[PDB]
Design a protein around this motif. Structure first.
Motif, PDB file in Angstrom:
ATOM      1  N   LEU D  44      41.054  50.524  43.892  1.00  0.00           N
ATOM      2  CA  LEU D  44      39.982  51.490  43.690  1.00  0.00           C
ATOM      3  C   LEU D  44      39.233  51.218  42.398  1.00  0.00           C
ATOM      4  N   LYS D  45      39.949  50.840  41.335  1.00  0.00           N
ATOM      5  CA  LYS D  45      39.293  50.544  40.065  1.00  0.00           C
ATOM      6  C   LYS D  45      38.421  49.300  40.165  1.00  0.00           C
ATOM      7  N   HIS D  46      38.958  48.208  40.730  1.00  0.00           N
ATOM      8  CA  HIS D  46      38.180  46.984  40.931  1.00  0.00           C
ATOM      9  C   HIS D  46      36.957  47.243  41.802  1.00  0.00           C
ATOM     10  N   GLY D  47      37.125  48.028  42.862  1.00  0.00           N
ATOM     11  CA  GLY D  47      36.009  48.340  43.733  1.00  0.00           C
ATOM     12  C   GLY D  47      34.950  49.229  43.113  1.00  0.00           C
ATOM     13  N   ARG D  48      35.367  50.217  42.317  1.00  0.00           N
ATOM     14  CA  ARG D  48      34.406  51.071  41.623  1.00  0.00           C
ATOM     15  C   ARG D  48      33.613  50.286  40.584  1.00  0.00           C
ATOM     16  N   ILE D  49      34.287  49.409  39.828  1.00  0.00           N
ATOM     17  CA  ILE D  49      33.621  48.511  38.883  1.00  0.00           C
ATOM     18  C   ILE D  49      32.610  47.623  39.599  1.00  0.00           C
ATOM     19  N   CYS D  50      32.984  47.085  40.759  1.00  0.00           N
ATOM     20  CA  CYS D  50      32.097  46.177  41.475  1.00  0.00           C
ATOM     21  C   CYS D  50      30.940  46.876  42.166  1.00  0.00           C
ATOM     22  N   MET D  51      31.113  48.128  42.618  1.00  0.00           N
ATOM     23  CA  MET D  51      29.959  48.883  43.112  1.00  0.00           C
ATOM     24  C   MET D  51      28.901  49.023  42.039  1.00  0.00           C
ATOM     25  N   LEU D  52      29.314  49.435  40.843  1.00  0.00           N
ATOM     26  CA  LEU D  52      28.397  49.528  39.715  1.00  0.00           C
ATOM     27  C   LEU D  52      27.822  48.166  39.365  1.00  0.00           C
TER      28      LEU D  52
END
Ligand code: CLA
Ligand code: CLA
Ligand code: CLA
Ligand code: CLA
Ligand code: CLA
Ligand code: CLA
Ligand code: CLA
Ligand SMILES: CCCCCCCCCCCCCCCC(=O)OC[C@H](COP(=O)(O)OC[C@@H](O)CO)OC(=O)CCCCCCCCCCCCCCC
Ligand SMILES: CC1=C(C#C/C(C)=C/C=C/C(C)=C/C=C/C=C(C)/C=C/C=C(\C)C#CC2=C(C)C[C@@H](O)CC2(C)C)C(C)(C)C[C@H](O)C1
Ligand SMILES: CC1=C(C#C/C(C)=C/C=C/C(C)=C/C=C/C=C(C)/C=C/C=C(\C)C#CC2=C(C)C[C@@H](O)CC2(C)C)C(C)(C)C[C@H](O)C1
Ligand SMILES: CC1=C(C#C/C(C)=C/C=C/C(C)=C/C=C/C=C(C)/C=C/C=C(C)/C=C/C2=C(C)CCCC2(C)C)C(C)(C)C[C@H](O)C1
Ligand code: SF4
Lengths: 129, 170, 742, 194, 42
Positions: D44-52
């Motif tokens: 979830l952290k990697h994905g949230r960083i990559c969405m941004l």
């Protein structure tokens, strides 16, 4: 047991497996059968685009003997599996006919080849002259 | 008992009709030494590569993609070594082969048939009987294509003519 | 047919389970570590199979499969030597100019400035210069291209895979029974006839059909790619009869016993080939053919399955006279029931053969262009002297392990072993006296000379100029060998080696070989050798003879082969074991072989190696200073160590800066070893206690409680770093010196 | 009991179809070694960083803050152009966010020490958009899916910026193919260095 | 993958050899791309 004339004067059968001896003899029989019949066959007729002993080296340069060696080598590998599995563990007349004509073929082929050394000729070619 | 294929050779004993395509042919006795699941995985992998390769030849003479230059398949190997698409194919094959390594561990651990990747998108295999016949046909084709492969590459080397053009000429 | 093959099928299961359980092989180590001593004891005893198992069968099985593993490593090592020659070498450039190009088969990556090591070895190439003599082997083999070096590399890899398969197969699938391993007549028949005899015969066939035609064309001057491939000599018998006309007659002269026809390629020339400075390969072919015959003949001596042959037991038990009691009785039982007794003999013989190889290869240079490649001549002499000295000390190491463990007095009553142990005081006292005499009358001559030269009294020195200690017996033997061609070896054309006397052989204006004259300095350093060898024998023989018991410790066999002491009593029994004489004898071996290679290095540079020019005179590397300066210690310090250390010290910033770094690094390791040799375990455990305390203070003490190394391991660690440091210093000093100047 | 994503492998333990985006994909068996709670936190952290980050690349192509330091259409060039002081301000603020939002339970041995702590659930719902429990399951699924897609998309965009020295949208609108006469892969050891 | 083979790779000498080879390897790589760093650049 086939072709038993009681002829083992040097008693090789005492110091080597009879199965190994029979297999080697029948292999020698059949190879010499092919070789002697082939030696007379070349002087009778010729395959297109193609004498006894020097023709071995006339054939190796083409790659014919090398190819034949490759296929005999393949068959002899499965046949060495055959002899190992033999050793690790109205027809009898025909077996005896095979072994008799094969011993005759060994004598015959030896004759034809040393006749080549004598005269530089094949078997029936010399016979004719 | 005796081998079904070679009458005078004894049956290997690790080849008791367990696998489909088993005719008892194993003179070197590699199955007396090595795991037959590993060997069957390799047999089907080598054969599937060979089948894709023989078709790969045939189609590549008949057609080639407009963006790629027209040339012979061995020349294609060397061209795509230096062009970059060869490394592409090598990378993606290696990527799939990672999950193949996991698959082979699953086979060794007893939970998978040696060449089974559950790849039946078109549902061609219907039930047990047609699937046994299909996998017998797959094994036979895989062995035959392995033989075929040697012929196309080696014959191109000896005579610099492609497989279809070599049938067409001579 | 009492010689038969017997095998247990599927003995041991191929499982990874014991891999995950370090120490599984012994009852002490398999219950896990509690102190750090367990970790060291794990590595120390692992290949001591007869310490884990009682049965000779399981021990023999572990040994047979471990020998396949060793073969797999050697084949992998050989395969890599060929691959680096095939891929990362200047071999092809060296074939064109063997006298100009320096062999190099190792290229470094550019990382931290280390690419300075890729020096200009020649032939448009940069790399690390190699001194193992592979290039000269490959040219002697008739390789002539990198393509053939790739096929040799694959041949090694296939063999490497086959040996590791056989080691697995013969331990896990088909392990021979003890009665198979206990066939000494059969094994000797096959290893003489089959291994050594067919080894030589097959190599002779390669030499005759490949090495002789290819190297005749090379030495005639034909370019390597202009030379026919090795099989065209095998088929086109007309082309082979061009170079050697005896081939026009084929194999009829062999079978009809008309061997003199084959004198084109089976010669007895002797001496060296003037073009390459190597042995005539027609001689080496005849040498290997003749060796092959009498190895095949020798392998028919022993009785196996048909009544013909000797019983080795009967030979040994019959050789007994009036001085030696029951004689060699019981020696057959020892050598077919003890692996250590077999390893003791075979290590001493292999070490001796390796020492002989060092002497024979510099004096009778066998390969083309190896004699004038002085870095290789120095490297392979020094390497094979060290292999010999190490293997000789392991022969006494395993003679001690036999005596402590495998020796049984009940089966050895009044035979040769019983009799040796029963007069070991007379042996060790007489050897001890010889070593004192030898040290006084070899090294004391040097001390006499140091003093006289220092005192201004050069007329009072043992020198060629002053009082002369000439080696008349060595000079006389040298006379005989120069007179041998045409006299006592009538059909030889030249001497076995030009070292005995005769001509100067020059290749590319560098001396291949030339007479090695012997003077007072040669008399002195040869008696230095006899002294250091005798003391090494003294330390190792005393360890074997007193391994079971002494006047000091009456029950030394109950303490074992390797124990540190039996306490501070009886005055102190530190280093009383048989292991501790191997430990002390490896230092004196190191001392011995260090003087041998120093004697070789200084003598070859001073009196043999160098350059030839007009008037035929030879300018040697150090200009003939050996005769008048190897008679004092100050001469060895000044004119050998100080003068020749110049290259390794001034090597920084060159391709030889690696040798300069290894010179210092090995000086470090040597000195660091003295921390372990001069110290004792009790100091180091008490120091560890305070270090454990600081860990306890921070709650970070380990559960494997740290210990100081054992008394034995402190000795073993000290000796290992001493040897690594001492030998590594000489290795760098030898290699940087001879690459620069030779 | 086979995986749904990879039909020929066995279904991995610690994957029971409870988590959003769980389809049985773990061929390398990391879930058997690493607790699935930590893995979902990190996913979830990697994905949230990559969405941004993916949105950052595309919007930074289109829209800029004023000033010459913020005028870099190519997003990889913005790294160097953007004021260093403010970039390190971002980094320090991220670190403060990491310690406070995790409530000093930062590590592999003390995150999830509270049994109430849930993977990826930091208490971040400023506008109470997850207040409705009917939308909860599909929000969790589409958050995981947006995160995975943006990881892949941002990875592609970065390495297409490396290969083509062009910003992502104008790399699509001014496309140039790979010549292969530059950026050959590997080769440090093939030529033996240099 | 076999658990006894993974327990073998978890043994101290293998992990010590692997970790310090991995550690040595990124020092080597860091000095390839960023060589001659006598100082922290500031
Ligand atoms: C047996 C003797 C031997 C020796 C001493 C060498 C030595 C060398 N080779 Mg050669 N080589 C050999 C055999 C040998 N080779 C063989 C048989 C082949 C044919 C396959 C080659 C093919 C070859 C090539 C193609 C190259 C070399 C190169 C090199 C050099 C650098 C190697 C390096 O750092 O890679 C390091 C590579 C790594 C992947 C690092 C691995 C480090 C791990 C951690 C070691 C761990 C071992 C492991 C723990 C053991 C336990 C197993 C486990 C289950 C517990 C070095 C001079 C290179 C060279 O000269 O460049 C100019 C080069 O390019 N070699
Ligand atoms: C002709 C028969 C023959 C030959 C060649 C050998 C050869 C060898 N034996 Mg012996 N051995 C033999 C019979 C033979 N053995 C018999 C009958 C017994 C029972 C009494 C034993 C019992 C025995 C024991 C117990 C041990 C050996 C070991 C060894 C190896 C010694 C190390 C060495 O120099 O290897 C290096 C030299 C080489 C030449 C490597 C060659 C590798 C292959 C195996 C050689 C033969 C290949 C083939 C016949 C050649 C084909 C030629 C073709 C191309 C035309 C060596 C391979 C020792 C060993 O190392 O075990 C592995 C060992 O411990 N042997
Ligand atoms: C079983 C063996 C076998 C068979 C069936 C053939 C059959 C044939 N060979 Mg071959 N050949 C053989 C062995 C064999 N050869 C061997 C051992 C060699 C030596 C390596 C050759 C070398 C050889 C050459 C060099 C050539 C042939 C050619 C031919 C063809 C000639 C047609 C002909 O005259 O027939 C009888 C026809 C008529 C009477 C009227 C038409 C024919 C198909 C020729 C051909 O056409 O090939 C393209 C050719 O050029 N052969
Ligand atoms: C979806 C993932 C993906 C991505 C991003 C790429 C990316 C690339 N591939 Mg690869 N490729 C992939 C999957 C992928 N490939 C797969 C699954 C295969 C089958 C195994 C291949 C087989 C392959 C080959 C054989 C070649 C490429 C080439 C290329 C390059 C094309 C250059 C370009 O954009 O102009 C082309 C633009 C278009 C084709 C527009 C559509 C580029 C590096 C080529 C190249 O130049 O390598 C350097 C090339 O020859 N690819
Ligand atoms: C064919 C040769 C051969 C064979 C098979 C053996 C076999 C054996 N020896 Mg013998 N030995 C040999 C040669 C041989 N040795 C030689 C040449 C010497 C003279 C040095 C000895 C001296 C010797 C002694 C003194 C002892 C043995 C012992 C043993 C046994 C235990 C082996 C073990 O567990 O060690 C495990 C192996 C190791 C711990 C390896 C470490 C050894 C060194 C320090 C590392 C090597 C350094 C390396 C080459 C260079 C490093 C490079 C550097 C720059 C980093 C085993 C029966 C022991 C025993 O009790 O037998 C019953 C024993 O005490 N041997
Ligand atoms: C330079 C260092 C050195 C020296 C001189 C010695 C000397 C000796 N060692 Mg020792 N040794 C050394 C280092 C040294 N070792 C080291 C480092 C080790 C470590 C492993 C050993 C281990 C060792 C063992 C294990 C053994 C020896 C043995 C010997 C003796 C050999 C016999 C001999 O040569 O007698 C002749 C004496 C000498 C050459 C000494 C020098 C005398 C010269 C000629 C000058 C004499 C001057 C004269 C006496 C002056 C008189 C007047 C004056 C008092 C005012 C001798 C006492 C062996 C032994 O004792 O058996 C016989 C033995 O078994 N040594
Ligand atoms: C302790 C509080 C503090 C203080 C005193 C400063 C002071 C400064 N900052 Mg810094 N900054 C801070 C916290 C702070 N910052 C934090 C916590 C962050 C990380 C989020 C940043 C990120 C940052 C960047 C990236 C930049 C500065 C810059 C500047 C300097 C010029 C400011 C200017 O002209 O503003 C007047 C201009 C404005 C007020 C325009 C504001 C533009 C909008 C509001 C940006 C949109 C915010 C966006 C939605 C962020 C949301 C994420 C966030 C809620 C976590 C000035 C020295 C700039 C600089 O270094 O110049 C040399 C610069 O480029 N700051
Ligand atoms: C979940 C994330 C998935 C990531 C997928 C990775 C995608 C990109 C991977 C490479 C793409 C294609 C490569 C072709 C490119 C290629 O193969 O070039 C070849 C190159 C070696 O050069 P050569 O010997 O081939 O030179 C050949 C001559 O033609 C030119 O001189 O191989 C490498 O070693 C480079 C990679 C570094 C190897 C170490 C990497 C770092 C190790 C870190 C720990 C392990 C991580 C995994 C290691 C595999
Ligand atoms: C499995 C799977 C699917 C799939 C799929 C695919 C791609 C299936 C493809 C299968 C293929 C390509 C089979 C090809 C076999 C080729 C053979 C046996 C070789 C014959 C050559 C010979 C005999 C020869 C020769 C010769 C020599 C050497 C040289 C010449 O001078 C002479 C000559 C020509 C005589 C799909 C996706 C549909 C879904 C499905 O649910 C599951
Ligand atoms: C949670 C929460 C709220 C919130 C919030 C926020 C900030 C929500 C924002 C969510 C965002 C930014 C989601 C973005 C997802 C991006 C994706 C999936 C992109 C994938 C790209 C791909 C596949 C690609 C590609 C490409 C490749 C490589 C080739 C290129 O040449 C081109 C191309 C682009 C085509 C708030 C704060 C309101 C409060 C509330 O109470 C709680
Ligand atoms: C190196 C390289 C390349 C390449 C390449 C490749 C892949 C070359 C291909 C190599 C292959 C596949 C050789 C195998 C041939 C099959 C054989 C010999 C089987 C014969 C059957 C026999 C003997 C008997 C069969 C039997 C008989 C009697 C009848 C009964 C059945 C049976 C018992 C089975 C490229 C193209 C990539 C280019 C690149 O730049 C360099
Ligand atoms: S403990 Fe050390 S000092 Fe004491 S007797 Fe034993 S070896 Fe000698």
């Amino acid at each position: 047991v086939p072709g038993d004339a009681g002829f083992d004067p040097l008693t090789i059968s005492a110091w080597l497996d009879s199965r190994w001896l029979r297999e080697a003899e029948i292999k020698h029989c059949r190879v010499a059968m092919l070789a002697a019949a082939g030696c007379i066959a070349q002087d009778i007729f010729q395959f297109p685009g193609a004498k006894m002993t020097a023709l071995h080296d006339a054939a190796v340069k083409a790659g014919s003997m090398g190819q034949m060696l490759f296929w005999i080598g393949f068959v002899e590998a499965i046949s060495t599996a055959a002899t190992i599995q033999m050793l690790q563990g109205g027809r009898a007349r025909m077996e005896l006919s095979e072994i008799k004509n094969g011993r005759l073929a060994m004598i015959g082929f030896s004759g034809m080849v040393h006749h080549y050394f004598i005269t530089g000729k094949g078997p029936i070619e010399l016979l004719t002259s | 008992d005796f081998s079904a294929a070679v009458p005078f050779l004894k049956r290997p004993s690790n080849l008791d009709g367990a696998y489909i395509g088993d005719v008892g042919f194993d003179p070197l006795g590699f199955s007396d030494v090595f795991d037959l699941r590993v060997l069957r995985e390799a047999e089907l992998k080598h054969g599937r590569f060979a089948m894709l390769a023989v078709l790969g030849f045939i189609v590549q003479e008949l057609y080639t993609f407009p963006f790629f230059p027209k040339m012979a398949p061995v020349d294609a190997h060397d061209y795509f070594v230096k062009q970059g698409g060869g490394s592409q194919i090598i990378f993606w094959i290696s990527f799939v082969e990672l999950f193949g390594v996991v698959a082979l561990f699953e086979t060794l651990q007893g939970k998978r048939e040696p060449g089974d990747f559950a790849f039946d998108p078109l549902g061609l295999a219907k039930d047990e009987a047609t699937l046994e016949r299909y996998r017998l046909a797959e094994v036979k084709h895989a062995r035959l294509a392995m033989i075929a492969i040697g012929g196309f590459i080696h014959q191109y080397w000896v005579t610099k003519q492609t497989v279809l053009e070599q049938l067409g000429n001579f | 047919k009492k010689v038969s093959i017997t095998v247990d099928r599927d003995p041991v299961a191929t499982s990874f389970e014991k891999w995950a359980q370090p120490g599984h092989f012994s009852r002490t180590l398999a219950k896990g570590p509690k102190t750090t001593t367990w970790i060291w004891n794990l590595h120390a005893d692992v290949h001591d199979f007869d310490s884990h198992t009682n049965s000779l069968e399981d021990i023999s099985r572990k040994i047979f499969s471990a020998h396949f593993g060793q073969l797999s490593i050697i084949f992998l090592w050989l395969s890599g030597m060929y691959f680096h020659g095939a891929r990362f070498s200047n071999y092809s450039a060296w074939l064109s100019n063997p006298t100009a190009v320096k062999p190099s088969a190792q290229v470094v990556w550019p990382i931290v400035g280390q690419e300075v090591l890729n020096g200009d070895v020649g032939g448009g190439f940069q790399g690390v210069q190699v001194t193992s003599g592979f290039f000269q082997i490959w040219r002697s083999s008739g390789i002539t291209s990198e393509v053939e070096l790739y096929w040799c590399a694959l041949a090694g890899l296939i063999m490497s895979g086959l040996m590791i398969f056989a080691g697995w197969f013969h331990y896990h699938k088909a392990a021979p029974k003890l009665e198979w391993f206990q066939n000494a007549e059969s094994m000797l028949n096959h290893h003489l006839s089959g291994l050594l005899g067919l080894g030589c015969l097959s190599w002779a066939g390669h030499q005759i059909h490949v090495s002789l035609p290819v190297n005749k064309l090379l030495d005639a001057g034909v370019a390597p790619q202009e030379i026919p491939l090795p099989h065209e000599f095998l088929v086109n018998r007309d082309l082979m009869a061009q170079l050697y006309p005896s081939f026009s007659k084929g194999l009829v002269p062999f079978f009809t016993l008309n061997w003199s026809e084959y004198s084109d390629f089976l010669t007895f020339k002797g001496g060296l080939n003037p073009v390459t400075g190597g042995l005539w390969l027609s001689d080496t072919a005849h040498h290997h053919l003749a060796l092959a015959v009498l190895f095949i003949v020798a392998g028919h001596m022993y009785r196996t399955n048909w009544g013909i042959g000797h019983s080795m037991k009967e030979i040994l038990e019959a050789h007994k006279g009036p001085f030696t009691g029951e004689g060699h009785k019981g020696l057959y039982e020892i050598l077919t029931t003890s692996w250590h007794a077999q390893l003791a003999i075979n290590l001493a013989m292999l070490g001796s053969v390796s020492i002989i190889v060092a002497h024979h290869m510099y004096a009778m240079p066998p390969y083309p262009y190896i004699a004038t490649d002085y870095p290789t001549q120095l490297s392979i002499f020094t390497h094979h002297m060290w292999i010999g000295g190490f293997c000789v000390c392991g022969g006494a190491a395993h003679a001690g392990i036999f005596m402590v463990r495998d020796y049984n007095p009940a089966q050895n009553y009044n035979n040769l072993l019983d009799r040796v142990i029963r007069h070991r005081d007379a042996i060790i006292s007489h050897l001890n006296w010889i070593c004192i005499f030898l040290g006084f009358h070899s090294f004391g001559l040097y001390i006499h000379n140091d003093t006289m030269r220092a005192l201004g009294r050069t007329q009072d020195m043992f020198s060629d100029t002053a009082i002369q200690l000439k080696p008349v017996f060595a000079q006389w033997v040298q006379s005989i060998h120069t007179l041998a061609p045409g006299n006592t070896t009538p059909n030889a054309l030249a001497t076995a080696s030009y070292a005995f006397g005769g001509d100067v052989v020059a290749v590319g204006n560098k001396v291949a070989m030339m007479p090695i004259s012997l003077g007072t300095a040669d008399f002195m350093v040869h008696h230095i050798h006899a002294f250091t060898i005798h003391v090494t024998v003294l330390i190792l023989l005393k360890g074997v003879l007193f391994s079971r018991n002494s006047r000091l410790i009456p029950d030394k066999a109950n303490l074992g082969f390797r124990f540190p002491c039996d306490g501070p009593g009886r005055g102190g029994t530190c280093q009383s074991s048989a292991w501790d004489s191997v430990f002390l004898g490896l230092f004196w071996m190191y001392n011995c072989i260090s003087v041998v290679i120093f004697h070789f290095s200084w003598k070859m540079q001073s009196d043999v190696w160098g350059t030839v020019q007009s008037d035929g005179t030879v300018t040697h590397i150090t200009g003939g200073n050996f005769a008048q300066s190897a008679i004092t210690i100050n001469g060895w310090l000044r004119d050998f160590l100080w003068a020749q250390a110049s290259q390794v010290i001034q090597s920084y910033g060159s391709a030889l800066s690696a040798y300069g770094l290894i010179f210092l690094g090995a000086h470090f390791i040597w000195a660091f070893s003295l921390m372990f040799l001069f110290s004792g375990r009790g100091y180091w455990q008490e120091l560890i206690e305070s270090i454990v305390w600081a860990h306890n203070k921070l709650n970070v003490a380990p559960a494997i409680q740290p210990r100081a190394l054992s008394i034995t391991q402190g000795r073993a660690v000290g000796l290992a770093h001493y040897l690594l440091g001492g030998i590594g210093t000489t290795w760098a000093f030898f290699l940087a010196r001879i690459i620069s100047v030779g | 009991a086979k995986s749904k994503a990879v039909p020929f492998l066995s279904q991995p333990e610690a994957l029971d179809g409870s988590m959003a985006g769980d389809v049985g994909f773990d061929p390398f068996g990391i879930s058997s070694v690493i607790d699935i709670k930590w893995l979902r936190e990190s996913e979830l952290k990697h994905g949230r960083i990559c969405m941004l980050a993916a949105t950052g690349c595309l919007v930074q192509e289109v829209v800029h803050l004023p000033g010459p330091a913020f005028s870099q259409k190519m997003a990889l060039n913005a790294w160097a152009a953007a004021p260093r002081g403010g970039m390190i301000s971002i980094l320090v603020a991220i670190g403060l966010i990491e310690m406070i939002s995790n409530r000093f339970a930062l590590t592999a041995t003390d995150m999830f020490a509270n049994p109430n702590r849930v993977p990826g659930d930091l208490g971040f719902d400023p506008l109470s958009l997850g207040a409705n429990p009917a939308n909860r399951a599909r929000f969790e699924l589409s958050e995981v899916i947006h995160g995975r897609a943006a990881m892949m998309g941002f990875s592609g965009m970065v390495h297409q910026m490396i290969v083509s020295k062009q910003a992502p949208i104008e790399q699509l609108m001014h496309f140039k193919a790979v010549d292969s006469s530059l950026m050959k892969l590997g080769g440090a050891a093939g030529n033996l260095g240099y | 993958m076999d658990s006894n083979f993974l327990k073998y790779l978890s043994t101290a000498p293998v992990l010590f050899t692997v970790w310090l080879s991995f550690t040595a390897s990124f020092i080597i790589e860091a000095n390839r791309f960023f060589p001659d760093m006598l100082y922290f650049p500031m």
